[PDB]
C-alpha cells in the first residue's frame, strides 16, 4: 500500500509543492512503521505528563541482546545516548582529533561525514569500482596513512554503493588501524538491512584491539523509518574515549533522549524481529526488480548492486551536466532524486534512488527514469 | 486530582526506590498536560511514519503571534532559531559568542547549568551574586558593574530567576540594559509565561532596537505547559551576525532541529491551550500563597522568600543551624520528602532549599505537613 505522505510535514514528501513530483531523495522509507512500535507510542500518550524522563531500567540489557543480530558480546557499561548518529560523527571528530588535524572518508559517502569534519581537515581514499561493485583500494588507503591519518570515518553498510564489508575487508584495514594507530567511528547505521547473500559484521567484532580503537554509532531511526524519534545507540568498549565522547556531550547541554526516542527504541529492539525479517525480502526484491529493468529498459545506465534501500546508478554514458540531468529529471521524468555530485570524488555523472517504496512507486519510479533518458 | 507518576519513567518519582517518600525537586509538574497537547499528539500517531520532518508551515506566525499576545513584542520570523533545550543553548551561546577563557557573567543563586556550562568549555566563570533584602532579592549593580570593568564577554541572565522566583520589572531590565550597553547577553526566559498577577515578564530583547542586537533570548513551552520530555525550545536573534554564529555551532555538532512531537505539542501549546494557562496561573499563584502562610503560621522558624512566577518556592533554614547533610538526612530518614538543596546553587545557596509547588494541594499539603514534622 502506497501511504499519502503529503501534509505530514515530512522533508521528502511536503518540500516540494508540485503533486506531479515523486520523490526518492530523502533516504526515509515510505511504508508503515512496525506495529508493535505505534502500540507503545499511543499506549505512552495515555499518561498525559510529559516531563523529565529517565532511560528505562531494562534498556541495557535489551541492546545488549540485540548478539541476536550480529553475535558481539558488549557490556552495558558501553551504551552512550545520542539524538542521532551525525553530532555524535561530530562529537567523534572533536573528541579524538585536534583542530587542524585530519579527518578520512571513502568516497562516494554520505555528505554529512564531508560538512562535519565544519569544525578539521580533509583526507580521501575513494573506492575504486570494480566487477559492478566498489572495493577499497588498500595500497592508496595505506598511502594516506603514511602521511599522519588520526582519525577514519567508516561507512559499514556504505551508503551510497551499498557494500557491506567482508570481514577479510575489514580484518585488512584493521590491520592497516592497529599498524598505524588510527581511531575509527563505525557508522552502521544501516546494520540491519542486510540481504540474503550477505551478513554485517561490526568492525570492534573482530578483535579486542580493534573495539579499544573503534566508536560504533547504530540506531533504529533507518531501520524501522522513526529517524524523526532521534534515537541512537553510540557503544564505544575503551573507557578512556568513552569518558571524551560523553564529556564532548555534556558541554554540550545534551542529557539524554526525548520520551519517544526511548519508547520507540525499546520496542524495535524487542517485539519487531519478525516485520524486519519481511522488510529485508521486499527490500533485496526491490532491488532485484530495478537492476533488470535497467537492463531491459534503460541500457544506457549503470547500477551499482547493493548489498545492503538505496540505489546507486552511473548515468556518465549519458554525457550530460548535473545542471542538464537535475532540469530534465523534474522537467519530464517529474522525479527528484539526490544529485550524486555531493557525494565526493566517484558520485560524479551519477544519481541516487530512494527503493524502500512499494513495488507500485518503484514502478513509476523507473518509468520516469526512462521516460527522462528515452 | 493528584495523578500517579511513579512507575513513568519519571526522573522525580522513579529515581528514588523507597516507596513512602513524597518527591518535590525538579522542576516539573505533576499536572495534567493541557488536553490540546493530548490530542495533536494523539492525531499524529495516526500517521505510522516517523521520518525526517521539517518544521510546521504556520509555526513562525504562531510563535510570533505569541510573543506579541503575552508580551507586545512583535519579532519577525527569521529571528526564530530552534533548539533542543535551553542549557544545549545555553551552552551554544557560550562558544559562539566568547573565545577560549574568556569571562561569562552569572548572578547566584542560579541554575546550576550556568555553572556547568561555563567551566566545562574552558571559559571564565564570574559571578555577581545576588543580594536578599526583606525576603526578596535585588542586583547588586554596583558589584555587576565592577565586574563589567573586567572585560565581561557575556552574560548569562535568568528572568525569571529560578530558583528564588524574581521576575524583572522593567526599570531593573531597563537598568541592566544601561550596563550591557556601557556585553552580550544570553536571556533565559523558560519562565516567562508562569507569572502572577501582580507582575508582569518584561522581554529584555523587547525594550529597545540597542538591546535587541545584543541578545539571545531562550524561552520554551517546555516548563510552561509540562512537556519538558518532548524538548521544545524557541530562540529568537534579531541581530543577523548573531543568529548566523550560534545556527553555525549548532550545525558543527549535527542539529538539524527537533522531533516530531515536539514541533507538535508546541504548535498546539501556543495555540489552542490559552485557557489552561490562565488556570495553571491562578492555581500556582494560591499555591505560593497557601505555602507562604503555612510557614509563617505553623513553621515560624523558617523564612521562604515570596516568588512572583512559575512554580518553585525558596525557603531559607539557616534558623535551624544544620549543615546541609544533617538537614538532608533529616529530610529523607525523618521527613520522608525529597526536597532540592541550595548550595548546589552558588553563593547564597547555603542552608537553604527549593521545593516544588506545582502540584495539587493535596500533595502541597502533605509537603508543608513533612517539612514542618521534619524540623519540629
Ligand atoms: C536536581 C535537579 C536539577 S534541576 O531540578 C533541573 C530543572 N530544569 C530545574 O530547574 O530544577
Redesign the interface.
Known amino acids: 500500500k502506497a501511504?499519502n505522505?503529503r501534509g505530514?510535514?515530512?522533508?521528502?514528501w511536503?518540500?516540494y509543492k508540485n503533486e506531479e513530483l515523486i520523490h526518492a531523495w530523502?533516504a526515509?522509507?515510505?511504508?508503515?512503521?512496525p506495529?508493535p512500535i505505534?502500540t507503545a507510542?499511543?499506549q505512552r500518550?495515555k499518561?498525559?505528563?510529559?516531563?523529565?524522563?529517565?532511560?528505562?531500567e531494562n534498556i541495557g540489557d535489551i541492546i545488549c541482546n540485540w548478539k541476536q543480530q550480529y553475535d558481539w558480546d558488549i557490556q552495558k557499561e558501553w551504551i552512550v545516548f545520542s539524538?542521532?548518529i551525525?553530532?555524535?560523527?561530530?562529537?567523534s571528530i572533536?573528541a579524538f582529533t585536534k583542530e587542524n588535524e585530519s579527518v578520512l572518508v571513502q568516497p562516494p559517502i554520505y555528505p554529512?561525514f564531508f560538512?562535519?569534519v565544519?569544525?578539521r581537515q580533509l583526507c580521501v581514499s575513494p573506492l575504486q569500482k570494480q566487477n559492478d561493485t566498489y572495493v577499497i583500494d588498500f595500497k592508496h588507503l595505506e598511502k594516506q596513512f603514511q602521511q599522519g591519518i588520526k582519525l577514519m570515518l567508516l561507512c559499514s553498510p556504505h551508503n551510497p554503493i551499498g557494500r557491506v564489508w567482508t570481514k577479510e575487508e575489514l580484518i585488512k584495514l584493521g590491520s592497516l588501524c592497529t599498524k598505524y594507530n588510527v581511531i575509527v567511528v563505525a557508522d552502521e547505521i544501516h546494520s540491519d538491512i542486510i540481504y540474503a547473500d550477505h551478513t554485517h559484521t561490526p568492525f570492534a567484532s573482530l578483535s579486542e584491539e580493534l573495539a579499544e580503537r573503534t566508536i560504533t554509532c547504530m540506531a533504529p531511526s533507518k531501520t524501522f523509518?522513526?529517524?524523526?524519534?532521534?534515537a541512537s545507540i553510540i557503544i564505544i568498549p575503551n573507557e578512556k574515549l568513552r569518558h571524551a565522547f560523553t564529556?564532548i556531550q555534556?558541554?554540550?547541554?545534551?542529557?539524554g533522549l526525548?520520551?519517544?526516542?526511548?519508547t520507540?527504541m525499546q520496542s524495535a529492539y524487542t517485539e519487531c524481529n519478525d516485520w524486519l525479517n519481511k522488510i529485508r525480502l521486499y527490500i533485496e526484491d526491490n532491488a532485484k526488480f530495478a537492476c533488470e529493468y535497467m537492463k531491459d529498459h534503460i541500457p544506457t545506465l549503470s547500477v551499482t548492486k547493493p548489498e545492503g534501500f538505496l540505489l546507486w546508478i552511473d548515468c556518465s554514458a549519458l554525457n550530460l551536466s548535473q545542471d542538464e540531468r537535475t532540469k530534465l529529471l523534474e522537467e519530464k521524468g517529474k522525479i527528484i532524486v539526490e544529485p550524486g555530485e555531493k557525494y565526493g570524488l566517484g558520485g560524479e555523472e551519477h544519481i541516487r534512488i530512494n527503493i524502500g517504496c512499494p513495488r507500485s512507486v518503484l514502478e513509476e519510479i523507473l518509468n520516469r527514469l526512462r521516460h527522462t533518458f528515452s
Open positions: 501511504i505522505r505530514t510535514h515530512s522533508i521528502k511536503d518540500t530523502i526515509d522509507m515510505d511504508f508503515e512503521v506495529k505505534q507510542l499511543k500518550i499518561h498525559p505528563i510529559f516531563g523529565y524522563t529517565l532511560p528505562p539524538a542521532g551525525v553530532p555524535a560523527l561530530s562529537t572533536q554529512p560538512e562535519m565544519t569544525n523509518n522513526i529517524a524523526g524519534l532521534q564529556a555534556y558541554r554540550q547541554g545534551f542529557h526525548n520520551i519517544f526516542a526511548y520507540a
